[PDB]
From a paper:
The complex controls expression of genes through two distinct activities: removal of acetyl groups from chromatin through the action of a histone deacetylase enzyme and remodelling of nucleosomes through an ATP-dependent helicase. The deacetylase module from the NuRD complex contains three protein domains that control the recruitment of chromatin to the deacetylase enzyme, HDAC1/2.
To explore the assembly of the larger complex, we used a longer MTA1 construct (residues 1–546) containing the proximal RBBP4/7 recruitment motif (R1). This MTA1 construct does not include the R2 domain and therefore each MTA1 only recruits a single RBBP4 protein. The 2D and 3D classification of the MTA1(BAH-ELM2-SANT-ZnF-R1):HDAC1:MBD2:RBBP4 complex suggested a relatively high degree of flexibility in the structure and a map of only 19Å using 10 066 particles could be achieved. It is apparent that the flexibility occurs at the point that RBBP4 is tethered to the complex. Indeed, the linker residues within MTA1 are predicted unstructured (Protparam, (40)). Although the EM maps suggest that the RBBP4 domains are relatively flexible, their positioning, and apparent range of motion, is broadly compatible with nucleosome binding to the complex allowing the WD40 domain to interact with histone H3 amino-termini.
Numbering used by the authors:
A (entry chain A): 9 to 52, 101 to 160, 162 to 163, 165 to 228, 237 to 340
B (entry chain B): 8 to 376
C (entry chain C): 149 to 212
D (entry chain D): 221 to 228, 237 to 330
């Protein structure tokens, strides 16, 4: 279990090894079985000067080859060594190296005017930031409504029902699911907010003149033959959506083909997995 | 209970980075949709962000870097190639149709919300599109073209003396760091993998410079970090940070590629652990601006930011995922939470305490009483 | 044949679905120079372009 | 009404939901709720769940309908005997209402 410094026959630094077994033969000759510690070069910088790797290479050599004893510590114990106790004899290991395979456990920051940002000075108590909020945002849902969860929930059911009845006027479960998709819901939450959270006013919006409204996402909206085109273009060009349009669906806008793609990936008849 | 403002533009899910590319904006649309069906949408103030114009993007970036972005297309892609190389647009930052539109929405969300925070008409403001933290003044990097974060922070400085920037993303937030490297008004704290990983920056010894020295905190990490290890090193450090840097507005980048089973990431965090950080920050009751960032196993990105939105509303949600347009995306399980993997945590207690202590020293160098 | 914006002007990429056999349904990716020369792998493309482009981070399959 | 009967044929369900019984019920729902549109709509979706009104036409089973067409073709318009011998579990007055609708 001890670690030793063997002869380096070339004149170079000593080879390091761990003693697995010490053997004496009948004629009193002493031989040792030893696991090799490899040097970083020999393992054929983050590697320190005194890095050694524990190999799966096993050799046996006579005891006369041993010139000195050493310590090959854990990484933590090497880093903890004091400046005075630093020696030629201290080495460390943190890696096991397969010598046969080659296997091993498993960029600059700049300064200057052209790198840093000019820091924006704090405004005086009298100074004003001068930022037009309408040019920056437009609100889509207020969180403090005169409405209760129940009523919003209820409205969402209604928004769904209209939608199903809409697509009944030019498959029952199919139309209902179609009408239950998110686009219809999102549209239902906007219809509320646009109408100032007045349920009675918002419902008119949904049935403008006795006629219902239809919201269809790209999934539902595409024709049978467009859908068909898409499944040919994908299976032929993979996920290259600009070429899929150029050559297969050039009348559609790229971003509609994207939206469709993702929605199509959940398709039932779609089974790429097993 | 804190008031939350949520920023979203429907178009953002539909912009596409390119075949074979890991960054997929669609993950925000997935979140959006869960939020609606988990009933959370209902409970917060929902804003569509108008497009940020070159006017306010050049408040940090080059007049001719933005000019380049406004101009570049896939049409004139072979005509510009000169400028393409000077600005880093290629191998892992593709050109793609709508690119500049995408940037405007991400930046608009963050800026609008910053204003909202300065105008003191919210407590928390959320923009999952934003958080794109690798961008530089005069070049794109790591999927980031415009650094919405910097711009956001620059607006906050108009009302806030000290702005704290916290970055959970597995990748070191070098864009936000470099932009504020020489100032004492903004402190950039970042916990990330380090060693054969992008962006190559943010080791223990990355402390800042000039007036900004002792104001850039970093925590370098190896693979496989638990929720338990992460929690035990985040809370101590952040409490000291608050203690010392005493900020008046927080900006938390909630990068979701620090979660377990990410495509690019190699950390072992659960939504629960990841969120515990957001909850801890929120607890310090400061004007807060949650942004997203990285995340490349989008099913979990969706889960995470949905959950973390609940946290900002301190409302409970069930593990049962609600039906939605993309419901079928979520495995055989259709649950909200993820559990950690058998993956081995190479962040030994000894290694974390060495670093922790070094940082506690760095933070002590700040003024106090 | 689609323009590949990250390569120099005129370079194009095409993806072809295999129609039969062992890998029916899988695809192969090809690149074409401006003159129309066809390339079938990353090392072949990198050998042709040499130091005029750095392809270290180039994803042959997606063209990004 | 159509969305109600979608939760356990599209045009059929819509027509079913468009029959008079549903309308009459809609005019009462208004009056009972004091002509408050917002209040009346809650009535229609009591707890997030819709309401179904089905007249005897729609309500009868396939096999009851069948029974009726045998009883008529066999006893003509003698509706007490049609019940006694063919649909004895139904009330006479429901068989009448059905007849006319049929
Ligand atoms: O449609 P994309 O945006 O290109 O992403 C897909 C998608 O990943 P997401 O579902 O996370 O978006 C596939 O997942 P499924 O459609 O199979 O659920 C995934 O397949 P695996 O999850 O089986 O890896 C595939 O990866 P690959 O192309 O390696 O098959 C990957 O495409 P990208 O790798 O181009 O992102
Ligand atoms: K980070
Ligand atoms: K700094
Ligand atoms: Zn990242």
């Amino acid at each position: 279990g001890d670690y030793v410094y063997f002869e380096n026959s070339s004149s170079n630094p000593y080879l390091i090894r761990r003693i697995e077994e010490l053997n004496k033969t009948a004629n009193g000759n002493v031989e040792a079985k030893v696991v090799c510690f490899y040097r970083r070069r020999d393992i054929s910088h983050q590697l320190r000067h005194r890095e050694l790797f524990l190999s799966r290479q096993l050799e046996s050599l006579p005891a006369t080859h041993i010139r000195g004893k050493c310590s090959v510590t854990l990484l933590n114990e090497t880093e903890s060594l004091k400046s005075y106790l630093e020696r030629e004899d201290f080495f460390f290991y943190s890696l096991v190296y397969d010598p046969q395979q080659k296997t091993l456990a498993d960029g600059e920051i700049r300064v200057g005017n052209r790198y840093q940002a000019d820091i924006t000075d704090l405004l005086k108590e009298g100074e004003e930031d001068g930022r037009d909020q309408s040019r920056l945002e437009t609100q889509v849902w207020e969180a403090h409504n005169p409405l209760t969860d129940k009523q919003i929930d209820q409205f969402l059911v209604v928004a769904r029902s209209v939608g199903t009845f809409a697509r009944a006027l030019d498959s029952l479960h199919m139309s209902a699911a179609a009408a239950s998709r998110d686009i219809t819901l999102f549209h239902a939450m906007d219809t509320l907010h646009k109408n100032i959270y007045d349920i009675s006013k918002a419902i008119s919006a949904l049935v403008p003149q006795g006629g219902p409204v239809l919201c269809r996402d790209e999934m539902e909206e595409w024709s049978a033959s467009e859908a068909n085109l898409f499944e040919e273009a994908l299976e032929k060009y993979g996920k290259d959506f600009t070429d899929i349009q150029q050559d297969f669906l050039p009348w559609k806008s790229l971003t509609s083909i994207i939206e469709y793609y993702y929605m199509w990936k959940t398709t039932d008849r779609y089974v790429q997995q097993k | 209970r804190r008031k939350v403002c949520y920023y979203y533009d429907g178009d953002v899910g539909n912009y596409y980075y390119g075949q074979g590319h890991p960054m997929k904006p669609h993950r925000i649309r997935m979140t959006h949709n869960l939020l609606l069906n988990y009933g959370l949408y209902r409970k917060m103030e929902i804003y569509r962000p108008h497009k940020a114009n070159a006017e306010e993007m050049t408040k940090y970036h080059s007049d001719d870097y933005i000019k380049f972005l406004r101009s570049i297309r896939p049409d004139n892609m072979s005509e510009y190639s000169k400028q393409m190389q000077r600005f880093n647009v290629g191998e892992d930052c593709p050109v793609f149709d709508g690119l500049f539109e995408f940037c405007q929405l991400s930046t608009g969300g963050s800026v609008a919300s910053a204003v909202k925070l300065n105008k003191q008409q919210t407590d928390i403001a959320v923009n999952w599109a934003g958080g794109l933290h690798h961008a530089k003044k005069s070049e794109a990097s790591g999927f980031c073209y415009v650094n919405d974060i910097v711009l956001a922070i620059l607006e906050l400085l108009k009302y806030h003396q000290r702005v704290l920037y916290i970055d959970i993303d597995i990748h070191h937030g070098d864009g936000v760091e470099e932009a504020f490297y020489t100032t004492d008004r903004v402190m950039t704290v970042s916990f990330h993998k380090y060693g054969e990983y992008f962006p190559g920056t943010g080791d223990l010894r990355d402390i800042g410079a000039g007036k900004g020295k002792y104001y850039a905190v970093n925590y370098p990490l190896r693979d496989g970090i638990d929720d338990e290890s992460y929690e035990a090193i985040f809370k101590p450090v952040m409490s000291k940070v608050m203690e010392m840097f005493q900020p008046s507005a927080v900006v938390l980048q909630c990068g979701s590629d620090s979660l377990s089973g990410d495509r690019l990431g190699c950390f072992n965090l659960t939504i629960k652990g990841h969120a515990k950080c957001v909850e801890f920050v929120k607890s310090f009751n400061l004007p807060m601006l949650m942004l997203g960032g990285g995340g490349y196993t989008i099913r979990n990105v969706a889960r995470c930011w949905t959950y973390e939105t609940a946290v900002a509303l301190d409302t409970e949600i069930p593990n049962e995922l609600p039906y939605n347009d993309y419901f079928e995306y979520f495995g055989p399980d259709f649950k909200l939470h993820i559990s950690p993997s058998n993956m081995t945590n190479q962040n030994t207690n000894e290694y974390l305490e060495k670093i922790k202590q070094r940082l506690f020293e760095n933070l002590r160098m700040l003024p106090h009483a | 044949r689609m323009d590949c914006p990250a390569l120099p002007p005129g370079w194009k990429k095409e993806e072809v679905i295999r129609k039969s056999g062992l890998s029916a349904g899988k695809s192969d990716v090809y690149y074409f120079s401006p003159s129309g020369k066809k390339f079938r792998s990353k090392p072949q493309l990198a050998r042709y372009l040499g130091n005029t482009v750095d392809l270290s981070s180039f994803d042959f399959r997606t063209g990004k």
